Amino acid sequence: FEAIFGTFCNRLEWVYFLTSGLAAAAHAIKFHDLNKLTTGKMLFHVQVP
Amino acid sequence: FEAIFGTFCNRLEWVYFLTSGLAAAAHAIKFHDLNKLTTGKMLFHVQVP
């Protein structure tokens, strides 16, 4: 005579990017045409004193 | 497609002479006939205790 008494699930611990401290380093933006963008560029015009 | 996310230019740190601490050591005067002035001098007279 065997008996099972128990069926238990390990509670998964959940992490989210925006709640982390590391997200402070980021400017997180959603852009739904990322698969079409090849390369994004930013360009700067400085004249010295 | 490529994207130009932004175009940037620098703004100089505008630094006036009379808005500095080094100006504390100076007594700053504007003189319009300066280019006529060859040499300016001061005279001191001292008697001793």
Curated annotation (Swiss-Prot), chains A, B:
It is found in: Virion; Host nucleus. Belongs to the herpesviridae major capsid protein family. Self-assembles to form an icosahedral capsid with a T=16 symmetry, about 200 nm in diameter, and consisting of 150 hexons and 12 pentons (total of 162 capsomers). Hexons form the edges and faces of the capsid and are each composed of six MCP molecules. In contrast, one penton is found at each of the 12 vertices. Eleven of the pentons are MCP pentamers, while the last vertex is occupied by the portal complex. Homomultimer. Makes the hexons and eleven out of twelve pentons. Interacts with triplex proteins 1/TRX1 and 2/TRX2; adjacent capsomers are linked together in groups of three by triplexes, heterotrimeric complexes composed of one molecule of TRX1 and two molecules of TRX2. Interacts with scaffold protein; this interaction allows efficient MCP transport to the host nucleus. Interacts with capsid vertex component 2/CVC2. Interacts with the small capsomere-interacting protein/SCP. This is Major capsid protein. The lineage of its organism: Viruses, Duplodnaviria, Heunggongvirae, Peploviricota, Herviviricetes. The gene is MCP. The chain holds residues 50 to 98 of 1370 of the full protein.
